[PDB]
Design an enzyme around this catalytic site. Sequence first.
Site, PDB file in Angstrom:
ATOM      1  NE  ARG B  10      35.560  36.748  33.902  1.00  0.00           N
ATOM      2  CZ  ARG B  10      35.699  37.102  35.179  1.00  0.00           C
ATOM      3  NH1 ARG B  10      36.347  36.316  36.062  1.00  0.00           N
ATOM      4  NH2 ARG B  10      35.184  38.251  35.571  1.00  0.00           N
ATOM      5  CG  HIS B  11      40.262  36.076  33.242  1.00  0.00           C
ATOM      6  ND1 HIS B  11      39.976  36.427  34.543  1.00  0.00           N
ATOM      7  CD2 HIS B  11      39.933  37.159  32.489  1.00  0.00           C
ATOM      8  CE1 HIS B  11      39.456  37.648  34.574  1.00  0.00           C
ATOM      9  NE2 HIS B  11      39.439  38.123  33.342  1.00  0.00           N
ATOM     10  CG  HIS B 196      39.327  39.599  28.724  1.00  0.00           C
ATOM     11  ND1 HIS B 196      40.149  39.998  29.765  1.00  0.00           N
ATOM     12  CD2 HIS B 196      40.139  39.430  27.651  1.00  0.00           C
ATOM     13  CE1 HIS B 196      41.392  40.100  29.330  1.00  0.00           C
ATOM     14  NE2 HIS B 196      41.414  39.766  28.053  1.00  0.00           N
TER      15      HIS B 196
END
Lengths: 264, 267
Positions: B10-11, B196
Amino acid sequence: RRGILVIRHGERVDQVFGKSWLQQCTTADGKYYRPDLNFPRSLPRRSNGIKDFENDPPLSSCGIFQARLAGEALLDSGVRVTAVFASPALRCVQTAKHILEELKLEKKLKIRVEPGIFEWMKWEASKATLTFLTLEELKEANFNVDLDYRPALPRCSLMPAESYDQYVERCAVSMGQIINTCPQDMGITLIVSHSSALDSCTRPLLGLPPRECGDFAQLVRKIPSLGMCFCEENREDGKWDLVNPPVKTLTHGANSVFNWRNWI
Amino acid sequence: ISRRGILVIRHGERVDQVFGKSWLQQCTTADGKYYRPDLNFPRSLPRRSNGIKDFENDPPLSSCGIFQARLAGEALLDSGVRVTAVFASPALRCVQTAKHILEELKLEKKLKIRVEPGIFEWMKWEASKATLTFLTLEELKEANFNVDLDYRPALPRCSLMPAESYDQYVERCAVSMGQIINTCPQDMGITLIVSHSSALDSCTRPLLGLPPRECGDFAQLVRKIPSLGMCFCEENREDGKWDLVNPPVKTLTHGANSVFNWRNWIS
């Protein structure tokens, strides 16, 4: 003008992992490892054992990020830093170091360790239960400390049972000496210390009486990592004025523990 | 021996996660330029078509987000693992996160970021009610992201339907993972999929031969994913099946830092 910038240390590991932190990162084998990325890459070389970090913990990785980000912002602000003093607590000295590194002054300026601005003994542990790194150890761990600086209060002079009033007096006495350690340079001096210092190291300069003890504890829990308090000296009036810190505040969210097994 | 692996990541923290939808307005002048009202806003914004207005729906990493991406990057270096490829969602927060990971891995020059709209966020949760734009490869290249200008996405940007259903979302993710896994299926290394929260489920289930989670079950699980949260899959030599395993780096836990102002909070 001449200014004093009081700065709280960055996030400390035990603020995140609790008193048990030291046990969570030490092999049965006795060695250090990172059970979570927020534990630092390594611990500095220490006497009396890894066992000593318990009462004098280091910055978390986040802590270091915080200290660097502030340092960088001080560079960007264009301000001139002329000296840095720091509490002997490892979290403070580390914070001082990373600020300097981002300011690009880690070589130019030497960190002056001042036990007189250490945490209020009351919130800490007794003498037999609290020890700091020596200048030698810091120098060896690569902190460009001032080996010649004569503290306004030497380490062993800290009374593990000081009252609130003794604490604020020692702080005023320490600020006294610091302000008189070459009172000429028209630059900013950094006091890298603890939450309580933002009140106990500025009030004396401002000629204010100590806050009521309850009123004081209530205010100092609200101080965040790298939280700042800025004071300037008036030319003629010689009085000190509380003013806006030269860098912005730092606001960011937590990051909670995760595990891909704790799917279901 | 080594196996082939997929690491979905995930970012890092995005500015609007901290400062809200109004963030863009807080860091814009009456003039119209960018400034940092708080240190957690990044040093600068990349060069963008339409100037500043487009960041609203495609926001950047906060300073903290960057710290997080770097920390993980460093940890991957330290782990000794071999990273052979990186794919990223076109969202700026993803591409930025991929970049910083590579820089800490020391491979920003050696590996090129392959932007893959197929692994973008579920359109349901994206206010392409304003219309998503993203940055173009050119703009990224110019903003100094070593992007792959030749990579043919399994789903080009304009093919994203601003009204996709949950079932369409999961299928497009499966289809994209498909093509990725067949983009030279040989190297015995780890491929990063920087995407995401939702991707930690929607991009690994297909590999695992699992059916999509029930939609409610899925949304409930993906809010619990933190920044730089990871999900690791390995491919079995013989079988050819994929196994869900421990990520090669530890988790990252840390506290918040709340807004302060001393002169004020004193009275």
